[PDB]
Amino acid sequence: LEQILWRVLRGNLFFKTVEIEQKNAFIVFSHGDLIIKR
């Protein structure tokens, strides 16, 4: 739902990854260096 909200509110300008943790989930996003505020 966070990837659907990020894709609906920001387009295809992000990375959708998921990592299993000990429960928790490891997520990682990639974007530009000047779009850290948005």
CA distances from 22 to 2, 14, 26, 28 (A): 21, 25, 10, 17
Binding site residues, another protein, CB under 8 A: 3-5, 7-17, 30-35, 37-38
Q: Closest approach of Cβ 4 to another protein, in Å?
A: 7
14: amino acid identity, one letter: F
The CB-of-28 to another protein minimum distance in angstroms stands at 11
Cβ proximity to another protein, 11 vs 24, nearer residue? 11
Going 37 to 10 to 8 to 18, the CA torsion angle's sign is negative
**Which CB atom, from 4 or from 25, has the smaller least distance to another protein?**
4
